[PDB]
Amino acid sequence: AALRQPQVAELLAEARRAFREEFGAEPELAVSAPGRVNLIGEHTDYNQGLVLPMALELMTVLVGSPRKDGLVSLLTTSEGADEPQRLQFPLPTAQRSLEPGTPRWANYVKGVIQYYPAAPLPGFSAVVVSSVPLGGGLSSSASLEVATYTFLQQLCPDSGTIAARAQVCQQAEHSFAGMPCGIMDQFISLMGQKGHALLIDCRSLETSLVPLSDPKLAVLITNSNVRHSLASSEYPVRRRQCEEVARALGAASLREVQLEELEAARDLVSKEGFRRARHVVGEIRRTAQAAAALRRGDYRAFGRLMVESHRSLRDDYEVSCPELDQLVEAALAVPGVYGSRMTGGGFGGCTVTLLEASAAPHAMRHIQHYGGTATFYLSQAADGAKVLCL
Ligand SMILES: O=C1CCCC2=C1C1(CCCCC1)N=C(Nc1nc3ccccc3o1)N2
Ligand SMILES: O=C(Nc1cccc(Cl)c1)C(F)(F)F
Ligand SMILES: OC[C@H]1O[C@@H](O)[C@H](O)[C@@H](O)[C@H]1O
DSSP states (O other), rough: OOBBOOOOHHHHHHHHHHHHHSSSSOOOOOEHHHHHHHESTTGGGTOEEEEEEEEEEEEEEEEEEEEEEEEEEEEOOOOTOSSSEEEEEOOOOOOOOOOOSSSHHHHHEEEEEEOOOOOOOOEEEEEEEEEEEOSSOOOOOHHHHHHHHHHHHHHHHOOOOOOHHHHHHHHHHHHHOOOOOSHHHHHHHHOOOOTEEEEEETTTEEEEEEOOOOOSSEEOOOOOOOOTTTHHHHHHHHHHHHHHHHHHHTOSTTTTHHHHHHHHTTTTTTHHHHHHHHHHHHHHHHHHHHHHHHHHOHHHHHHHHHHHHHHHIIIOOOOOOOOHHHHHHHHHTTTTTEEEETTTTOOOEEEEEEEGGGHHHHHHHHHOOOOOEEEEEEOOOOOSSSEEEO
């Protein structure tokens, strides 16, 4: 009864309704980009490391039509969007470029338009909707960016690569949302495939599509329903930090650095710095293993590596919060659970629990033993960016 069933036919319906009511015509176009859960490989992406996200059935739909007047008209119905629900603005030019500001939800769309690599980009009308809980750790921002991107490609096809559209979305996040993220979230919103995880090499940008066939094993995403103050603020600090180590170690990134190399170099770098690279360099290894373990389909070693990932993110990288520790520590003591850990950037958001679908009704009865409000998603590994024509 705390479990938010996804309703994706309802999400598109809602979207179509609101559009015809707002603008006076049936929309021509529907796109979706999903939210994500990162199964293992946390704070590795910007250290050119490995990440094992899968796409969620939680998503962000644009529905909309091209305009002859060169201007953009956005209406959002997302519950937690900041006022106003509606912004219009001329397309950028050589002369004027878009500026981030108010409302913030509109900055991600603006961002993508501002860096969209193709021309001529005509003006549009769009309703924006989302079942991705906003600031809940499941990449609402990447779903909206990649949803925008996808809608723009129908207006003006790009002659480019997935990485290029990921980078464009990532630039919008940096410039327009002030969030210096890596490419896991964008990549996965773009490239996810139903019943697969997506093993992303963030040095080479080689990708692997890893079957999650087995219908026994499932994944419980548990929303902590907190986004602590230090989240916004401590992400860039971590990055700056990782940068200095590589700087001091004559290493083009932490990817190339391996743990035997860091152990020796305790004193080349800071004490703070050393306890954090231990996570990155280590993390990178356990994402490889989890990868190789998933192919072998040892649901068990999922745990060792996934529970170890939390410990490392909590004790070493310091991007957990009591609420996460108590959802993780609560899950990892339940028979019928391979393992649990904070997912995405931390200081709040969701845990992810690899468990036997048989014990789903027991875990959701047990957790909601949590000192806070728990929201539950039972996540099929899902499709990436989708167009449907109306
Ligand atoms: O303030 C923060 C902290 C960082 C994470 C986060 C936010 C806010 C920014 C905008 C207003 C609500 C809160 N928004 C997202 N929004 C994401 N917002 C959407 C709105 C409509 C459709 C799809 C969307 O995806 N993420
Ligand atoms: O993770 C899953 N299954 C899984 C199966 C075998 C080994 C491991 Cl580590 C995982 C998922 F996504 F299907 F639920
Ligand atoms: O694993 C940490 C991740 O945090 C996400 O929220 C961020 O957007 C990703 O780029 C990655 O840094």
